């Protein structure tokens, strides 16, 4: 909290909490699935999966690999994005919308096409 401020630290740890719980439930999800989990857990798993896919990003060096050009996301955009994801403002959007995107505008733009 000293260097990178309280907000960044709060969001960073909150993201880790969600991803940690998701990893713990992997064993149960492997056999049974999402159905046997509780209402709260169901939502956490949904958010966790979307967070995992949002962490993916286009690389400037990887034009030959992917095809699309890379994207650079400022700190303010990053903090705000994961803030909205943790609160659950983008629960309506599909999983494919989060895959391989930089800014929040590109999420909404790809959401319409799908």
């Amino acid at each position: 909290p000293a260097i990178v401020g309280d907000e960044h630290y709060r969001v960073a740890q909150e993201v880790i909490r969600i991803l940690q719980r998701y990893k713990d439930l992997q064993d149960i999800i492997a056999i049974l699935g999402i159905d046997e989990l509780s209402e709260e857990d169901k939502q956490l798993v949904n958010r966790a999966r979307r967070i995992e896919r949002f962490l993916s990003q286009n690389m400037m060096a990887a034009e030959q690999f992917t095809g699309q050009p890379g994207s650079t996301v400022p700190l303010k955009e990053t903090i705000e994005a994961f803030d909205k994801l943790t609160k659950g403002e983008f629960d309506h959007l599909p999983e494919q919308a989060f895959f391989l995107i930089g800014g929040l505008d590109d999420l909404a733009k790809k959401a319409e096409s799908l």
Binding site: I31, L32, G33, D35, E36, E39
Partner: protein, 145 residues
């Protein structure tokens, strides 16, 4: 460490047999469900001729999820079972239900007024009133198994 891995093999190995068992137990209950519907259908047919002349247990995939989804959507647009009652809040119905089970609830529903479709094993889509309640219950019991 082997100790951990050996225990996990034992774990998964045991669970496999449990899942495989409940798979084939559900394969039995579908046959009895359909057989019960074969008896119910011609009865309701004979009742309609006159009137015209005048889940508890889990481990059922997305059975409850699909039904509750359609329910929530229909209620929002327009306006039985421990699992369902739990969802709505935030029973003890047999696997092969008789009429005595759905007699009392049917009567109270009829008195109030006075005063999952089975397709395949994989595919399930979510006086006279008493028979309608039961006719659904069997098809629901089939869809569950």
């Amino acid at each position: 460490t082997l100790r951990e891995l050996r225990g996990r093999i034992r774990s998964a190995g045991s669970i496999k047999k449990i899942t495989k068992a409940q798979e084939l137990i559900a394969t039995s209950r579908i046959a009895k469900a359909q057989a019960r519907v074969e008896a119910a259908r011609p009865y309701a047919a004979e009742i309609t001729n006159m009137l015209t002349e005048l889940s508890d247990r889990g481990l059922c995939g997305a059975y409850n999820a699909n039904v509750l989804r359609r329910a929530e959507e229909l209620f929002s647009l327009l306006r039985v079972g421990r699992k369902a009652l739990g969802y709505f809040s935030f029973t003890g119905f047999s696997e092969r239900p008789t009429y005595e089970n759905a007699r009392e609830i049917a009567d109270t529903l009829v008195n109030a007024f006075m005063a999952t479709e089975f397709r395949s094993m994989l595919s399930q889509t979510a006086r006279y009133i008493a028979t309608r309640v039961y006719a659904a219950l069997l098809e629901a019991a089939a869809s569950e198994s």
